[PDB]
Every structure is written in C-alpha cells, then in structure tokens.
Amino acid sequence: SAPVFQAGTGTDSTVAGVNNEANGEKSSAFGYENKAKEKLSSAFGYKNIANGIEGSAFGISNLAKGQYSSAFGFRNVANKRHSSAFGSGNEANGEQSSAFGFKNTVSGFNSSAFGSQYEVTGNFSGAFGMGEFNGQYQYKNEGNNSYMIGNKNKIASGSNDNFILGNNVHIGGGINNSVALGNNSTVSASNTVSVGSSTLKRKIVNVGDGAISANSSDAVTGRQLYSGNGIDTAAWQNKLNVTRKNDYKDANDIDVNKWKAKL
Amino acid sequence: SAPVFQAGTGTDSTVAGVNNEANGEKSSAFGYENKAKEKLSSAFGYKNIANGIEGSAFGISNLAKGQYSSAFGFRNVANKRHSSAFGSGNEANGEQSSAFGFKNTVSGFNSSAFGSQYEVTGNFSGAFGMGEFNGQYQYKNEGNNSYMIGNKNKIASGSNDNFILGNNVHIGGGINNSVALGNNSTVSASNTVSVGSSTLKRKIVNVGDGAISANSSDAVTGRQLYSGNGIDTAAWQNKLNVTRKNDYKDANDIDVNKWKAKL
Amino acid sequence: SAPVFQAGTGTDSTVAGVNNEANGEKSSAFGYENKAKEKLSSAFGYKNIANGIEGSAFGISNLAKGQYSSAFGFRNVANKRHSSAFGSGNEANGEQSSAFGFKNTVSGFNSSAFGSQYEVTGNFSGAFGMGEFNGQYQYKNEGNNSYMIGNKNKIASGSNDNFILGNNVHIGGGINNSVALGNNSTVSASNTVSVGSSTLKRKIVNVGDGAISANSSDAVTGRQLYSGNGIDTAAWQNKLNVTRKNDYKDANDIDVNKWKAKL
C-alpha cells in the first residue's frame, strides 16, 4: 500500500509511514509497520512494538513492555519498570536493571550486565565481560551482592558477597566473603583471598616491611626472616632448649654430682 | 489540532507531527511537541528539546543543551560538550563524560558512571555499580584518579589515587595511594593494601615461595618458617645467645677460675 | 528544495524530509539528507548512511556498514556483524564488539571498551577507563584474554592472560599470567602478583594467621614470627648448632680428654 501520513485512532496521535497504527493517547508510530498501543508511547523504525506507558522502541524489531522502559538497537526486550536494553539481543527482566552490549540477560533487582553473553540472576550484582550462549546460558551470576569481571566465571546460588577478577573461576555453594585474583584460580573456603590454585601458585612481590610485635596482623618479607630483628628472645630461648653463653663461662645450673662422676 | 507535515521557520527545516517547531538551520522535529532550536539539531519522540549545536534528543522528555551532546531514552540531561546520557534519569554535567544505566550523575572531566545511582564529582574517575538516591546522593566519588566497583562506597575530597573493589568501604580524608579488597574492609593509612578490618581478618592462600636473602621484598609462606632454610646463621646465633655444640665438646671460651671453684 | 513525504525507489519504501533517498526494500529515510541503501535499513536524523542489511543509523552523521549493526549518537561507525557504537566518536571494527562512551576503538573478536579514548586490539579482552588520543592511540590493549581498568595502561603483543587495576602500568613482552594492583606498579615476571614498584613498596594489613606445617602455602603474620609457635624444633636445633640445656646439666657428649687437659 502507498505510504500514509495522518492521525491514528487515538487522541493527538500520529502515524507516518507504511501500515502504522497508534492506538494510544499522544502516541507516535514512524516507519514500517510499527505499533504504539499505550499512553505517550513512541515506536520508530522497522516493526517496533511499544506496549507500555511511556515506553520507547527505537530501531529494528524492538519490544518495550514495561513502564518507563527503553529498547534501543536490534532485537532488544525490556520488560520491567525503569529497565534498559541497549545494543543487540539484550533482555532486561528486572526492575531498574541494565543490559548493554551483545546477547546479555539480567533478571535481578538493581543489576547490571556489560559485554557479551552473561546472565545475572542475583540481586545487587554485576557482570563485566564474556561468557557463552548456545540455546542456554552456561555461565551465570546467581549470587547476591557479588561482582565478576572477565571470561567464563560462575557463582552458585547461596554464595553471597563474592568478587571475581579473572578467568575460569567457579565458586561452589556455601562460600561467602571471598576474593579471587588471577587466571585459573580456585576458592574452597569462606573468608579467604586466593592468588592461585593447587597446581600453579603465584608469588607476591614488592611488599613493605610489617611490624614485628605481639598484636601485629601484617605480612612478613624475606629479609625479616633472614635477619631476625624484633623477635621475642625469651620465647625462642625456651622453645629451643638453649644453654645461654653467659651462663656457660661461669658454670650456672650445673649438677655437680654427675660432672664429678665423669671427670 | 490536526497533524502537520511541512517546513519550519528555519532554512531547510522540517516539522512532522503535532505542534512541532524547528527554529534552526537544517533542523528536524518529529513527533509530539518537539523543539529544535539550534543548527543541525534533531528532536525525535515525545516532548524533546535540542538546545545545542549538533545535539540529539531521542525518546521521551530528553534535554540536550551542550555542543555535540546526546540524550537517549527516558528523561536524560546532557549539558556539556561531548557528553552522553543513555538510559533512564541520567545527567551528564562534565565535558567528555558518560552516564549509562539508572539515575546516574557525572560532573567531572573525563569521568564515567555505569549502573544505578552513583555520583562522580572527581576528575579522571570511574564508578561501576550501585548506590542510593532519596533526593540527595548518599555515596559519591569525590577523589581524582580513583575508581570504585561495587555497592555503597565512598571516597572523600582530597583523597586521590585510590581503588576500591568491594562493598561498604569508606575512605576518609588524607589517604592516598591505597587499595582495598573484599566486603566490609577498612583503609586507615596511605601506601597500604587491606584485605579486611579490625573485626574480621582474611587469610591469603595459594602463595608461592619467596626468596630468603638480604634484599628480598617477597612474602613468606608457612612451610618456610616451619623448616628454616636460608637464614643467616650468625645473626640468629648472636641474637639468641647460644653455645655452639662444636665449642662444647672441647671446652672453648671457658673461664677456668670459676669452673675450678665449683668442682 | 521543499520537504517531501512519499515513497522511495524501493518496494514499500518511505522518504520523509529533505532530499532523502531509500533504495532498499522496506527501508526508511527520515530527516535531512539520509541514505538507506539496503534491505530493512533505517536512517533517522541528520546525514545518516545505513549501508548494511538490517542496520540502523540514529542521530547525527552516523555510519552503519555491517550486518545487524547499530550506530547511535554523534559520528559513530559500526563495521562488522553484531557491532555496536554508542555515544560520540566510537568505531567498532570487530565482530560482536562494543564501543560505549567518548572516542573508543575496538577491533577484536568479542571485546568491549567503556569510557574515554582506549583502543582494544586483542581477542576476548576488555577496557574500562581513560587513555589518550592525539591522532594516534598512545595506550592500547594488544593482549588476548586480558582486562584493564584505570588510566594510561598498556599491554603488549604476545602478553596474554593479564589483569590490571590501576594507573600507569606498562607490561612488556613475554609476560603471562600476572596481576598488578595499585598506582604506579611494575610487573617484570610471569606468574606473579605485584603490589608496588622498586621505588615505592606497599604494606599488606589485616591478614589472618596461616597454618605452620610442612605443606602450608599460607602467608605469615608478624605475631607468628614474634612468638615462634608451631616450628620444627629438630630442624632449627640442627641448623643453629645448639647445646640442649637438658644435655648440659648431665655432661652428655663431652670429650673427656680435652676437658681434663684444661682443668
């Protein structure tokens, strides 16, 4: 059919293009076969559907179903209130959630995904980097208040307050308050910081000198063990049974009977 | 009023929709009550204002006031040159600054905010994650050349060159060149790395063996203290006064008078 | 010329604005001098070119050449399949790559850049932060499976699996599996974690107690060296030649001849 430029079926509505329908109040449909069905809804481009109040669909084959939702780009879906899908193949099924990049899915409250093919299902969590998609998501962030940066990382359900900066790190169930650093690292306990695994271990370099005292929670360098400054003399002396040299040149604490017996 | 499709009050201008005005040169107003007031300005959607030269407002109720500014989505404000606001409720008041996600504010030179309700007021700084907004911002990044990733983190004014990867970390004034790791961690000094607080402390696991020499700034593992290889024999011998065994089977350094007195 | 609103030279095409041409099937050109040349292509705004199948150009002077490509904002270029350029001056020359913010360039497979003036040329890599541009890029991420966060960081070609969280860190060739933390840090070896440089060194605080055993790869705190609990008594006793006190009050292992000679 020939292009048409006129008013729609709603009050103060506008259709401009080919086979466009604007059924809402003050709604706008511009392009090829766009649908704006609610109040103050905008559908611009090729086959866009705006099915929420004050929702915007811009680009090619975008869906905006939630209130104050935004779908921008190529085949993006926004479903909840104040959700944002930007890029290619992004789905946002969480309130105040953000999906930005290629094939990302977010379904948590106040969660963010940036990059390629991650899924975040936890609350107040975040993903930065790359995963894998072949029909189902193989790497997900299922923990609350946890953040991961890198490639092919996993956090299970029930493991909360965890941070990953690296590659190929899988955290099992029952682990909380842990940090993992480096490529191919393992975490197997709570309240720990790991810098390697059981097959490869990493050295820590360029470390300052810590205090050598009773209540001192500071790391110790190699030179401090090499020298021995600041140690408790009495404890080391009564741990390794030692005859003090000043006590040896004057015959102190000597059993006279046995010494007379031998000599 | 009925929709109208014609030229505006500017040279080579275009208005298409309901009650649109395009007062600039080569400007375009498409949709419902849009305003393009400057040269090469584009206003597309519902009630958009483009008040800068080569500024773009796309979506619902967007403002683009700066030069080469971009406002995309739902109620976004871009104010400076080369500033970008993408998503819902974002404000960018810094030159070459970026706000992306839900309710973020950036007011620094070359600064970036991604996620939910952070404010970045420092220069060359960055925020990734979630904060809080109830009329005023409760968590801000006020430091220069500092970066924070997580939930509910604070950096004060005057504290520069700091990096946070975690939750609930507050850095006070006068602290520079520090790194914080983990959930509920504290930093109280400059030139330090913290892996815990004064109530909970974390272990470091999977650490390689460091060098035991005079000039060795490497960490020491448990097996190295357990064994004792590579230590300076003379220093440990003259620190803990020790009678050497080879000197004991031949009566070396013995005061003859006192030994004769006892025996 | 006067604005025109009609069909283009393609089947089911639409031109709306000033001097617009839509040569593709079901293509749309809206605004000022826009060009949609392929199938299902959309060009909205000021001087936009959509030269790919299902490509979208939205804003001011945008180019979308790849298949399923998206250029949104001010002077953005998308060239490959499923590539996304969002913001000001972004170029995406990699398949499934994302450029978001100010003047970023990505040319790798599944790579992401967020912020201001970084270049990422490696595969499965990522950049978050700020660099420099003066005609050529001065700081690039040329490594594979590597991630960097901060300001003015470099990774060379051939250095893979590296992670940087900091400022002014340059990694040379031949270094793999390394982590760098802090401002002005140096990495000079593989399989290492650095917390400083040769001019400034950092202390590690709030560390828990590690196990003191033969097979124990845990860090040691200051109090453990101060006290001395859990050490191997025999090894420390036969390293520092020590006369055991219980062996001194009974004259054990004494050469009788030399003791008789002196007394």
Add this chain to the structure above:
Amino acid sequence: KLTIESTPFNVAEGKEVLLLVHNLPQHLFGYSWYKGERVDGNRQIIGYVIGTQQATPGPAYSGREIIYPNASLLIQNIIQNDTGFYTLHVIKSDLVNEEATGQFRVYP
C-alpha cells in the same frame, strides 16, 4: 495540594512535635526532610526509600528525629534553636519532584 501541618503549633521546651502531611501523591519513589525554605544538600535531616524500605540520616542529624512510612516527622526534646521552617521534598515514580513547607515556633 500537598500541605504540611504541625502538632502542636506552640510547643513546650521539653515535649515533642509531629509534622504531618495532607494530600500525599500516590505512586512515590522517596522523600526527604530539610531544614529551611530551600532544597539544600547541606541542610538535610533524614530520608526514606520505599523500594527497599530504607531510612538514612543526613548531615543535619542530632539524633532526635524519627521518620514514618506515611511521610511524617517526629522531633523530641525540643530546644530553643529548633524553631523555624522545615521543607519536604517528594519524588514521584516518573522522576518529577514536588516541595512543601511548614513552620513552628518554640517558647520558654
């Protein structure tokens, strides 16, 4: 119209005062309480967030103020420097803002 009323208008030197709100808009996001006649960041007392049921104090928090879920304020142990104006800031779900003002005096 959004209105603020005070009970009692004339307050003693050791009693409490309750600030109540009439015509509260529906579909809110949060609200906060200020000291003065303008929305100033440095003169904020307490704020509330509905989506997470959160209450957070502000820079001007002496420890004698209680907020309520119906956007009402309670101030106890009144001293002579607590007399004057208070301002209420309301955020709607569409990110639009509203303001209101109330007043009371303290006598010995």
Add this chain to the structure above:
Amino acid sequence: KLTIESTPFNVAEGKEVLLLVHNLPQHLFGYSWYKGERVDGNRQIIGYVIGTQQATPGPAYSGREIIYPNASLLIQNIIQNDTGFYTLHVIKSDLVNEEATGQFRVYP
C-alpha cells in the same frame, strides 16, 4: 521443513543410535539437544557453537553422547531408560529460533 530421523528406529540393547537432520537452515549460530518435547534448561544434553568451534555438555550428560558439525547426534551403549523423544533447538544468525522433534524406542 526441519526434520529429524533416527537410524535405526528399533535399536538393540547394546548398539548405537544416530539422529540425523534434514533441511538444516543455512547461516546458523548454534544448536543444542534436549531430552523431551520442550526446550527445558534442566534437560539439555550437549550444545555446539559455530563461531568458536565449541562443544559443551549440559546438565543431562551421562558421557555416551557425541555431537557432529552437521548437527547430528550419536548415542552409544543404549540402556532401557533412553527410549522416547528428543528435541533439537536451532538458532539462526538473526537470533530467531526453530525447533524439531524425533522419537525412538528400545526393546530387549
């Protein structure tokens, strides 16, 4: 139309079975194999990604299944609880999905 065929339809208790695909769409992105008549996440066997030449097992992986680049499946050492339906999910380059179903039985 995308079709799945099984060889042999009647399978012994210790031989192998091959599931082949006719009318495979061109310009694909990936495909996966499921147990049952619906695309369920908990009943996925193996999946393949073309862009990186990757094969990854799923939650339902007994270790006897092999995928092939022409989207075909091989199951060896058949036991009595492996009889029924299998479902193939295909992802095209434009992110649109397609499905197909096949069936076989096992006899002693």
Add this chain to the structure above:
Amino acid sequence: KLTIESTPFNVAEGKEVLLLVHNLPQHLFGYSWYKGERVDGNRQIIGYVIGTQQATPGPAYSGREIIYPNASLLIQNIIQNDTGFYTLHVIKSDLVNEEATGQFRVYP
C-alpha cells in the same frame, strides 16, 4: 588553506630548522607530526593535546624535536638523513581531520 613553510629552506649541517603553519583552523582538538607524505602510525614524531596541555613523543623520536602551542616544529642538530618531507595532521573539535605537507633538503 592550511600551509606549511620551512625556515630556512636550505639548512646547514649543524644548525636548526623551524616549520611554521599558516591558516591554522580555529576550535581545534589536537595535532601531530609525521615523517613522510602519509598519516602512518609507525612514522609519528610528536603530538599535542590542547584540553590538558599535553605533549607526547612518538615511535620516531630521536630527542631533537620540540613542538610549540601554535602548531610549529623545531628540529636541531640536523644530520644528513633528516632531509625530505614532513606531514601535519590536524583534528578539529567536530572530529573532522585535515592534513598538510612540507619539504626541505640538507646540504653538506
């Protein structure tokens, strides 16, 4: 039109040479200097950024070159392999680029 001129055109073997620019566009972002007749990354000498007042050397930096805020170049201690063409690249505030070329020779 953007033009480059050299002083002096004929240079001695131990003196200096100054490259100056006429018709510099206003509202710039940065500029850089190259060796040759094309904008090649491997043959860049020095670059300047206006917004932060920054000067950075390039891959081709022998240590004898000085840039000036008016987009001018100074080369001192001329040797025989420094004769030929130089190219100036200019970036405007709207991200559009411009180029110019200059030439000089060295004689013993």
